[PDB]
Design an enzyme around this catalytic site. Structure first.
Site, PDB file in Angstrom:
ATOM      1  N   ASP A 194       0.769  -1.053   0.021  1.00  0.00           N
ATOM      2  CA  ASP A 194       0.116  -0.128   0.095  1.00  0.00           C
ATOM      3  C   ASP A 194       0.905   1.303  -0.111  1.00  0.00           C
ATOM      4  O   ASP A 194       2.254   1.110   0.147  1.00  0.00           O
ATOM      5  CB  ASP A 194      -0.849   0.049   1.365  1.00  0.00           C
ATOM      6  CG  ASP A 194       0.075  -0.100   2.454  1.00  0.00           C
ATOM      7  OD1 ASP A 194       0.999   0.479   2.699  1.00  0.00           O
ATOM      8  OD2 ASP A 194      -0.241  -0.998   3.481  1.00  0.00           O
ATOM      9  N   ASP A 196       0.844   5.256   1.651  1.00  0.00           N
ATOM     10  CA  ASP A 196       0.464   6.033   2.876  1.00  0.00           C
ATOM     11  C   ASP A 196       0.826   7.740   2.725  1.00  0.00           C
ATOM     12  O   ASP A 196       2.073   7.790   2.640  1.00  0.00           O
ATOM     13  CB  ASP A 196       0.897   5.622   3.977  1.00  0.00           C
ATOM     14  CG  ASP A 196       0.276   4.270   4.477  1.00  0.00           C
ATOM     15  OD1 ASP A 196      -0.720   3.936   4.099  1.00  0.00           O
ATOM     16  OD2 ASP A 196       1.151   3.399   4.821  1.00  0.00           O
ATOM     17  N   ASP A 250      -3.744   5.309   1.383  1.00  0.00           N
ATOM     18  CA  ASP A 250      -4.113   5.678   2.471  1.00  0.00           C
ATOM     19  C   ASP A 250      -4.031   7.320   2.647  1.00  0.00           C
ATOM     20  O   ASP A 250      -2.783   7.652   2.533  1.00  0.00           O
ATOM     21  CB  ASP A 250      -3.745   5.003   3.829  1.00  0.00           C
ATOM     22  CG  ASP A 250      -4.493   3.640   3.917  1.00  0.00           C
ATOM     23  OD1 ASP A 250      -5.634   3.387   3.388  1.00  0.00           O
ATOM     24  OD2 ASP A 250      -3.831   2.905   4.518  1.00  0.00           O
TER      25      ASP A 250
HETATM   26 MG   LIG Z   1       1.702   1.017   4.200  1.00  0.00          MG
HETATM   27 NA    NA Z   2      -1.996   1.997   4.354  1.00  0.00          NA
END
Ligand SMILES: [Mg+2]
Ligand code: NA
Ligand SMILES: [Cl-]
Ligand code: NA
Length: 326
Positions: A194, A196, A250
């Site tokens: 992911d 962020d 995110d």
């Molecule tokens: Mg991460």
């Molecule tokens: Na994340």
DNA sequence: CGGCCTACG
DNA sequence: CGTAG
DNA sequence: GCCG
């Protein structure tokens, strides 16, 4: 010579005990799937201690005196040193319960509790879940549709491309606001699952109401495959040669007064931050979160202008992000 | 034995 | 319940 | 599972 909390020692991203740490982390993960958070923590901590050592463990004697190594974790290491495999670890790896709980908990929108209920109902595969969409939340539906893309890590070059698009949207939402890369990429990872970002503005208060304005703009650009405030858990369209792929991103907003705490929290690692909060409370009597650091005796919040300030407040030697890979 | 991080969506 | 690190 |  090895301190007991992970936040008291540097832990680099790559190290000299990779195989041993990976095996202990299998047992930690399996403990989590059974709801045994204490055991999970111990195995995670023991694995982390090995990541912090300056050379390979070659003999059982070298575990003596290391924190978080008792009879069980020592036996795991001993078996790996003697035979190259630990029977308990291999039994976990092959187990239907481990493999299915791992697959299901990878789905965005599915945690241990939901995975375990599905397991108990007899479900085993992603296609099993697809055949009964009546049992799925909208979040789980998106997680299941995008599971394949989300299972492949993205590269730092991809991350840099995403940061430019986020910065464009943020700049229109609020001129002067800034975007900082956090998470594992800030700790030096070259690829990860992911991405962020932490968003603030140098004028305290100006960031109020910012995240909805950013989300609307990214949605208008066609970049948002899924979204649901100050934290947004999104799936984004990432360009790829001739096509694109889904990526979990995110977005987090903090006021500048809180930015050092939010940067520290969102840079991780997860174990590092749990250990740092534990150290703060148990050793220093101060309560740490991603918003601040509270003295419950004076009933006051520490002001911090940097991560360096926070480490100083807590009486810890500063660790750069690259050394927080606990 | 109790404790195990601490939030937001 | 999920999410985050 | 381990620590204090
Ligand atoms: Mg991460
Ligand atoms: Na994340
Ligand atoms: Cl436990
Ligand atoms: Na999940």
């Amino acid at each position: 010579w090895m301190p007991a909390y992970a936040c008291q020692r540097p832990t680099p991203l790559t190290h000299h005990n990779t195989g041993l740490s990976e095996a202990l982390e299998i047992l930690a993960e399996a403990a989590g799937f059974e709801g045994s958070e204490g055991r999970l923590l111990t195995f995670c901590r023991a694995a982390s201690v090995l990541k912090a050592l300056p050379s390979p463990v070659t003999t059982l004697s070298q575990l003596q005196g290391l924190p978080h190594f008792g009879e069980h974790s020592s036996r795991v290491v001993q078996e790996l040193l003697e035979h190259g495999v630990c029977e308990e670890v291999e039994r976990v790896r092959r187990s239907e319960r481990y493999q299915t709980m791992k697959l299901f908990t990878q789905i965005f929108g599915v945690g241990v509790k939901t995975a375990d209920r599905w397991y108990r109902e007899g479900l085993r595969t992603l296609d099993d879940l697809r055949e009964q969409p009546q049992k799925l939340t909208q979040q789980q539906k998106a997680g299941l549709q995008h599971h394949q893309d989300l299972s492949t890590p993205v590269l730092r070059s991809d991350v840099d491309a995403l940061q430019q698009v986020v910065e464009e949207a943020v700049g229109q939402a609020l001129p002067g606001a800034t975007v900082t890369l956090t998470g594992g990429f800030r700790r030096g990872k070259l690829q990860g699952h992911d991405v962020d970002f932490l968003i603030t503005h140098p004028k305290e208060g100006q960031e109020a109401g910012l995240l909805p304005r950013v989300m609307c703009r990214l949605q208008d650009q066609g970049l948002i495959l899924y979204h649901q405030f100050e934290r947004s858990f999104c799936i984004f369209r990432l360009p790829q040669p001739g096509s694109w792929k889904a990526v979990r991103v995110d977005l987090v907003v903090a006021p500048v007064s809180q930015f050092p705490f939010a940067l520290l929290g969102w840079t991780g690692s997860k174990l590092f931050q749990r250990e740092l909060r534990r150290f703060s409370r148990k050793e220093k009597g101060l309560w740490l979160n991603s918003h601040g650091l509270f003295d419950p005796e004076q009933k006051t919040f520490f002001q911090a202008a940097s991560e360096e300030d926070i480490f100083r407040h807590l009486g810890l030697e500063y660790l750069p992000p690259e050394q927080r890979n606990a």
